[PDB]
Design a protein around this ligand. Structure first.
Ligand SMILES: COCCNc1cc(-n2c3c(c4ccccc42)C(=O)CCC3)ccc1C(N)=O
Length: 208
């Protein structure tokens, strides 16, 4: 079954701002998603020091960037801690509410959209370039889920029946028609070098 949920008002508001605000420096979405991946990898790595069996679902800690011109998608894959159903439905949104509030206030103060990560809500920057975001995720303590939202105030969660992931997260960006530059090898290389050069995990840029 597919379950549909309403974003809390503040999150819907932030998503609308991200979609509606004129802001040319869209490339920062990638550093935010890679940051999310890095944090998730740090988390499982740290947890594994006390419980080595947490890596039974996979020892390699890495990030893959996968462009697909046929589907017009850019996929950011990591073998981080992943997310439970409760993370997807409740926990992330609960934490994000205060980050969203603070971010929107800072914006009203003169901050700009590129500072979104300082508020812990960098994930939503995905909507700078994507009409729809699909998040496939697998945490050790739960099943594989697909979260999805085209904004408009609602998201869906379902159990995922695609290729099993072992552990980690895939963020699938269904790019906007005018944002296909982010499928180009040289463009992604440029952005990673500029914003994500010191990430402590191998980042592999797949080619088409
Ligand atoms: C320590 O790592 C646990 C959380 N990890 C992630 C979280 C997200 N992410 C998601 C959020 C979110 C909201 C605020 C902040 C981050 C958010 C959603 O609300 C939809 C699902 C994915 C997106 C991607 C990741 C990731 N790559 O692990």
């Amino acid at each position: 079954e597919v379950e549909t949920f309403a974003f809390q008002a503040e999150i819907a508001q932030l998503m609308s701002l991200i979609i509606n605000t004129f802001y040319s420096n869209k490339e920062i979405f990638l550093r935010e998603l890679i940051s999310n991946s890095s944090d998730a990898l740090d988390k499982i790595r740290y947890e594994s020091l006390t419980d080595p069996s947490k890596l039974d679902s996979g020892k390699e800690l890495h990030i893959n960037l996968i462009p697909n011109k046929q589907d017009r998608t850019l996929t950011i894959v990591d073998t981080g801690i992943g997310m439970t159903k409760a993370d997807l439905i409740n926990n992330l949104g609960t934490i994000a509410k205060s980050g969203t509030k603070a971010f929107m206030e800072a914006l009203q103060a003169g901050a700009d959209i590129s500072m979104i990560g300082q508020f812990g809500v960098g994930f939503y920057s995905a909507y700078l370039v994507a009409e729809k975001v699909t998040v496939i995720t697998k945490h050790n303590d739960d099943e594989q889920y697909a979260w999805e939202s085209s904004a408009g105030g609602s998201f869906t969660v379902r159990t995922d029946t695609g290729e099993p992931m072992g552990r980690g997260t895939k963020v699938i960006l269904h790019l906007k028609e005018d944002q296909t530059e982010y499928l180009e090898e040289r463009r992604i290389k440029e952005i990673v070098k500029k914003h994500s050069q010191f990430i402590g995990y191998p980042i592999t840029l797949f080619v088409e």
